[PDB]
Design a protein around this ligand. Structure first.
Ligand SMILES: CC(=O)O[C@@H]1[C@H](O)[C@@H](COP(=O)(O)OP(=O)(O)OC[C@H]2O[C@@H](n3cnc4c(N)ncnc43)[C@H](O)[C@@H]2O)O[C@@H]1O
Ligand SMILES: CC(=O)O[C@@H]1[C@H](O)[C@@H](COP(=O)(O)OP(=O)(O)OC[C@H]2O[C@@H](n3cnc4c(N)ncnc43)[C@H](O)[C@@H]2O)O[C@@H]1O
Ligand SMILES: [Zn+2]
Ligand SMILES: [Zn+2]
Lengths: 249, 249
């Protein structure tokens, strides 16, 4: 919490944010690399594989239905709320997220780019069908397609796969027009997201990183808040609404 | 703070609110009875008079022109913000305001009964014509009328006049269901509005009054928060958002 930090956020011309699983952790959703991620002694990187779904669809789907039921009952925590607020007040123009939970929209956020897909999405492993669901499917019985009849999968992006074309470009646009970016709850490793903030930094724009841990992005972000996105973001937006009251209006 | 108050708000089955000009002060819009209310030494009550209008329509329109000029440029404050926030959260079911400015909707409120008219509206004194301006009117020239050509007026309500159409019945229905009503920045002196809360109260409902001063409503309010609606409404809407995360879900 600094005057310059605030002045920066306050005077943004096109401020954007990039969120990761860390931002939802206080909502009870396990991160991807934290100890809270171990599911049956499995690391997330061992199930979100395109091969793992092939080696054994049963196990992977159990993991997803399990995650789904959790995200579908979870409540958007303070951090989510703060970003939703920062967009209402007009400061934040766009929110880029790697999370697949709809915890941001549940806070109210309008302009949201889902780089890695959504859990509400279930597309086909055979045809071109895809739909949104409301509940987690009791997994014991493997999900089949209501059309061409075949195997269904989580409408999310796995490693080695490729994120929706249009989506990355829309993001490439936001950060290519942004002057300031808030990077919260992400480990600064998985690409091509990690590279997004570096873009702003290249064009001169400013970076604000919110993370309890030091990350390979820290060493270059203009400012670096050491805490949980819940507190930081909330206490932050609180001072932003105050700073927002100055000049012409 | 007080947890009992919070519980009441958080657990309310149908909460509604009655606001007054006290909720638009911190936006720079004077109240009806405050020291800031005077205009050319005239008092509001003695100018927003249907008689005072016929007696000298040029002065009264000059006054309204001046007021609109302010409102059509004024920005919504924390109280405005907060009432809109509590509506998105699903707690505030309806907001009944006596304010003729349009700040509540601006902040984002959706369900708003405008008890006393609108400065955004101009209806004719004879024909049944009535439009909605978006900018202040040039005062030297009195308004026309693309219908019968008679004098035009602000679409508001003056003393001794009737309230807009189904308005009173609407608010009458709201408070006849309301288990909790928040009454912010109104002097609880002018009828029939000052009665709406009494309705709730004689039904075993809870009245949370918010006003820097003591009013004829104060001694019957279950909670009397003596402070500016800007700060009181902000702190309160925050506690509630959080506390709104307990039990079963
Ligand atoms: C497969 C898939 O859907 O894709 C995922 C995921 O989108 C992507 C990146 O992972 P991501 O960086 O978002 O998750 P990670 O598990 O890689 O990183 C989460 C970050 O959150 C931080 N963190 C934990 N609790 C926090 C809190 N309360 N507030 C703020 N930060 C906290 C933590 O220190 C860490 O850097 O790779 C994965 O491949
Ligand atoms: C004709 C017309 O325009 O109609 C009006 C108006 O709608 C109605 C009632 O007036 P109303 O009660 O709404 O305005 P009033 O001017 O009568 O009262 C405003 C109240 O707001 C309180 N107040 C002042 N500043 C405040 C702040 N920053 N936060 C919270 N409260 C503050 C103050 O103490 C006072 O009781 O009568 C008038 O006839
Ligand atoms: Zn299919
Ligand atoms: Zn007319």
């Amino acid at each position: 919490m600094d005057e310059k930090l605030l002045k920066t956020i306050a005077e943004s011309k096109y401020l954007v944010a990039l969120t990761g699983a860390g931002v939802s952790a206080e909502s009870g959703i396990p991160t991807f690399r934290g100890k809270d991620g171990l599911w049956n002694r499995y690391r997330p990187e061992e199930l979100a594989n395109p091969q793992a779904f092939a080696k054994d669809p049963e196990k992977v789907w159990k993991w997803y239905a399990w995650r789904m039921e959790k995200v579908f009952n979870a409540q958007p925590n303070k951090a989510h709320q703060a970003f939703a607020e920062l967009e209402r007040l007009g400061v934040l123009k766009c929110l880029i997220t790697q999370n697949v939970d709809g915890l941001h929209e549940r806070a109210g956020s309008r302009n949201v780019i889902h780089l890695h897909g959504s859990l509400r999405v279930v597309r086909c492993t055979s045809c071109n069908n895809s739909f949104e669901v409301e509940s987690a499917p009791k997994i014991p019985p493997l999900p089949k397609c209501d059309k061409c009849g075949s195997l269904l999968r989580p409408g999310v992006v796995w490693a080695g796969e490729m994120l929706p074309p249009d989506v990355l470009d829309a993001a490439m646009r936001e950060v290519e027009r942004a002057d300031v970016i808030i990077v919260a709850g992400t480990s600064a490793v998985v690409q091509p997201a990690a590279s997004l903030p570096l873009i702003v930094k290249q064009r001169g724009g400013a970076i604000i990183e919110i993370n309890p841990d030091e990350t390979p992005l820290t060493p270059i972000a203009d400012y670096s808040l050491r805490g949980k996105a819940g507190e930081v973001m909330d206490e932050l937006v609180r001072h932003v609404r105050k700073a927002l009251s100055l000049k012409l209006n």
